[PDB]
Amino acid sequence: SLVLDQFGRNLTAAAMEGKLDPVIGREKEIERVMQVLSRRTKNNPVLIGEPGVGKTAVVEGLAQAIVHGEVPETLKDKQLYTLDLGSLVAGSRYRGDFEERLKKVLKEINTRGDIILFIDALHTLVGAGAAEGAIDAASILKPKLARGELQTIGATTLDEYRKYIEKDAALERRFQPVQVGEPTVEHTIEILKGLRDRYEAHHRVSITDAAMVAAATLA
Amino acid sequence: LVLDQFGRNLTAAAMEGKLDPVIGREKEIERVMQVLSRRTKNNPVLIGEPGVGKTAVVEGLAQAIVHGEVPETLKDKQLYTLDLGSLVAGSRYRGDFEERLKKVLKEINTRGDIILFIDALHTLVGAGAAEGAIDAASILKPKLARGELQTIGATTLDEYRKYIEKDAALERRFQPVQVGEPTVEHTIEILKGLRDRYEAHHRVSITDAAMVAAATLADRYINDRFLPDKAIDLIDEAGARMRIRRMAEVDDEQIAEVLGNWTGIPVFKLTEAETTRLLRMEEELHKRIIGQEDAVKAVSKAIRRTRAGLKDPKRPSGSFIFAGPSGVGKTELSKALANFLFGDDDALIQIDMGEFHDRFTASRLFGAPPGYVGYEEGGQLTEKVRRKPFSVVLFDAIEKAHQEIYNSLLQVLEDGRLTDGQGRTVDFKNTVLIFTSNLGTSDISKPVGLGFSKENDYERMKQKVNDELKKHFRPEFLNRIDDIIVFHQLTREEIIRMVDLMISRVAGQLKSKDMALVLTDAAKALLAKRGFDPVLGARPLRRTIQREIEDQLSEKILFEEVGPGQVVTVDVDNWDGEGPGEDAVFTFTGTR
Amino acid sequence: MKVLILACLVALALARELEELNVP
């Protein structure tokens, strides 16, 4: 795109450039969002979970699964863009500027047809660009999200899901809650073993297997 | 035209087959057509909970127009879903919004064959209202008067009153159409009408067994969504999980797998590894609790009722009073049951009721009412079960709560429901509720009456607990409990096995030091005989293992007399089981 | 015998500042 580069970060372009961390495990959660994204209608997974259990990582693990071809043919060669709502609000001082930016984004999604959207902090879609008389981004997306003509991943914490998304009961319907559970200690050691090379290369250190068994156990 | 650049022509979408078949809901499609032909209150606003098919009624109205199944006064009308987003978009200048809405309304009056549909009619308040500009609500309010604007609306029941109702002007013009949540039998007919859409998108086959299961299991195991979609959610995601496997038959069992992934409630058909695991569940709980066989069986009768699809679905999956003496495994069984069902005993929703002895700490269980601080996050009981409906909920020390809390939890055992602070009912029908009591231990001394009396510490202690129970609780609270289990005192032979269960925690922490902890049979006999109280059980044993093993080992490790890579063998010097067992002392010798 | 009257604190906040849409 060019409309969607300035309001989104392409995670599949980031996953080809090795700019996303490896997502070890979480494969039942990536399989789960590939089911919800493969649905006919309401094909919109919201990743709910406690803060830091890897909700943003599941999508980044999904974006790595796309570029390594480990997705179905439904999700094959999808360009996953993380919709920056803050960029989409920014500089919308005139009436309808926010709304026409979101319509130009949604028009670019429909013409390409290969765009998964990741609205990280999906609770910020409620009231997104809702100034004086300014139809928020939630009311614009709710026709698109209900009929399956927009494939959007949300990610919200469990507190922010009951505080902001469950208080708009029409919007929580359009999204399927994919519970991203907190890893076990054994699952977290696997995460640390697969993240080992990223933190060894960054800190110019070597991380013993004892240190990551301790880091998951002691934390 | 003017209406295509803002609205979506639903009638043209129904000609091209792009709208889903809206079967059923016919009595309310034709009721919308009744309201459009009225004298006043001729604007049908479809009110209903989100998901019951309010948009589908007008999508079913568009399909009725293109089939010629409408009256001649609504024949060949063009439904337009006027979205406010396309109407605000653009408008980077003045009046842009009022003239783009005047050109919409002029085009409705010019052709005269437009039935306007304003989905989310509550969002009409504050659309295009720019600085020195009037919103879309103020522009149309008038048009409604002239009756030059028959609109169809669609709000929720909350947002109908929250807005459309209030406006008194709208009241005499808008007519709330109840769009009811369909029944299970209506939803099956919706899913049968929607087979060919979801069987063609996923190129699967959806059996009649699956759609009956989709509408039945969605009504039963969800309390946050609504019949139409809640069940289309199961059909569509199962066809989506199935089309990942062929890269073609969605069955009863494939629906319950999707409901299992989504609610977290195991409703799916038991695998062979898990079927025998529930057969040996009492044997698997006995790996973590010693003795207490009547209590391990009764929580085994409850879990196996649930996985045999056989519990009363108007009542929690298990309801228990664990009662008896302090320290014999009431909380340990609740943690072991949560460790069985979830692999981790921190998955136990442990609501420790001793900190609820105030009258008004019930607001911690269900949440604050709205408008009072902490309403938005309120409920440490209700929100943890709203997220995990299949849960073991431990109400530890239930007798130390206030009486008004039991009346709150009385609806729980009756209906399986609990109204929280907001007012939403939280489904407790899949929970194992465990109300741990400590009654029958405030006088426990081998409880005897007067003299000359000639099996008193259970068969009798049990009826003392049940007597203290019913004089403390309401009788309608205890009749709802499935099993009231008075626990046994731990026998001396159970304390010997409780030594193995407690040394294994100490030995496991020495494995982190690469040390082993071997105890002789005389060492475990001495811990058991000095750790046996016939009135408390296993916490005097814990304290004995701390004082005699752990506090001595904590010195020996810090002295580095024993260290890493060294098996600490624990033998006893002096004494041989036949003495009093308090002249003898442990000795700690490292070997390798 | 005694009753404690608690005190249900209400959530009360100042009115929201709004952000404006410009019409030139």
Ligand SMILES: Nc1ncnc2c1ncn2[C@@H]1O[C@H](COP(=O)(O)OP(=O)(O)OP(=O)(O)O)[C@@H](O)[C@H]1O
């Ligand atoms: N399965 C995983 N494999 C590897 N790294 C993971 C995994 N899950 C999470 N992480 C890492 O954990 C850190 C935090 O994860 P992430 O930011 O996705 O959490 P989150 O649930 O989105 O949190 P928040 O709700 O606060 O945004 C990151 O370094 C991320 O890469």
Ligand SMILES: Nc1ncnc2c1ncn2[C@@H]1O[C@H](COP(=O)(O)OP(=O)(O)OP(=O)(O)O)[C@@H](O)[C@H]1O
């Ligand atoms: N009678 C019906 N026949 C067939 N499908 C139906 C019927 N009622 C609802 N549906 C389907 O259920 C799903 C949700 O319906 P719809 O979007 O109209 O609900 P809604 O109440 O308008 O939702 P919201 O409040 O979020 O706008 C859609 O897939 C719709 O086609």
Ligand SMILES: Nc1ncnc2c1ncn2[C@@H]1O[C@H](COP(=O)(O)OP(=O)(O)OP(=O)(O)O)[C@@H](O)[C@H]1O
């Ligand atoms: N029957 C038992 N089987 C195994 N371990 C037990 C048993 N009873 C007690 N223990 C051990 O003692 C610990 C504390 O006992 P626990 O809290 O389970 O007793 P309780 O009777 O529920 O307590 P209380 O009566 O004070 O409410 C347990 O975590 C476990 O280590």
Ligand SMILES: [Mg+2]
């Ligand atoms: Mg995140």
Ligand SMILES: [Mg+2]
């Ligand atoms: Mg709708």
Ligand SMILES: [Mg+2]
């Ligand atoms: Mg206890």
